[PDB]
Each structure stands twice: as structure tokens, then as C-alpha cells.
Design a binder for this molecule. Sequence first.
Ligand code: BZ2
Length: 187
Amino acid sequence: LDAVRKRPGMYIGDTDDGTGLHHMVFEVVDNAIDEALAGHCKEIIVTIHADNSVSVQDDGRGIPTGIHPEEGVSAAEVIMTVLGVGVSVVNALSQKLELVIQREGKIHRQIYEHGVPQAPLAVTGETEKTGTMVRFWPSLETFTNVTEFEYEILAKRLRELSFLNSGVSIRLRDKRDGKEDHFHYEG
Ligand SMILES: O=C(O)c1cc2ccccc2o1
């Protein structure tokens, strides 16, 4: 997790032309699409926030929250902090990352900063629903020159993804200007 911070282009792509930056999104989206291909997730929402963060929400099972017997911390944290390339790469290159899991009746929440958990995964409330929400703020120490997310890049890729994932609702939302798209292919 520190080799990643020192040579990020190897892991994420060009950190100066926007390629790496948008691949951060797609790596999180991949995690959600994995749940859809296994048949558990029917809806994904990608949101570009106005504070330079992107969130990806899915309605799958939720990342397992029980304690990993080998590692001694929640399985979710194990996924976020141990070496597509992996969601831990995104976590490593994010100055902040918010993880919210809905699973087994309980809402779980955890905050990271540069891949380092600020506290253990914690139960915060109760929920009928299930799914994973990941919201990340890319680090401007890593990402240079191109520092804004670009709607059309995200839209083009997500549209491309809908065709490979039948019956999966993929919504893109931009809170900067209200733009909104919905890719839902059913063939
Ligand atoms: O219920 C499970 O075994 C489960 C849910 C899930 C979500 C993301 C990654 C792995 C996962 O495993």
C-alpha cells in the first residue's frame, strides 16, 4: 500500500492526463458490476459530487463485515487495504474514502485517509436494505493537471458497460450541473 503511493502510474495509469483519475471511478464501478454478474445487484448509481468526489452505490449483498480470522479486522477493511487492479489502489490514492455497507439488518460505516482507516468498521444504524456505497476524494498530491471529473468520459464507459450487463440499471448523476443519464439495457 505504500509502493502504490510512490509509483501510482504503474497501478492506476497516467496521473497527469486524467486517465488515471477516471480509472479510479471505473475500478470502483467494477466492484459493483462483479455483484451484478453474480446476480445480486440490479441497480448501480454513480454520482459526481460538487466537492470533487465520486460515489458509487450498488444494491448487492454488501461487502462482508465480519472479522477476518487471519487479519484480525473486518473483511471489508481487508478488501480496502490489501493488494482490474483492486479497490485498495483507489483507497491508497484517495486522500479520503467513505465506505457505507448495508448488510444483515445493520448499516456499517468507515472512513479512510490515504488508505489508512480512521477507526474500525462501525455499526451506525439499522436497515431493511442491502448494498455497498463507496465515496472517494482523489488526492491532489497524486493527480495533477487534470483534476476535474468529466461527465462524458464516465457516460461513454457506463453506457458501454450496460450492454455487457443485461437487466442492470446504471444511473449517472452530476451534482455540479444536474446532468443525469440512465443506461438500462434489457436484451
Ligand atoms: O455474501 C458474500 O459472500 C459477498 C458479498 C460480496 C460483495 C463484494 C465482494 C465480495 C462479496 O462476497
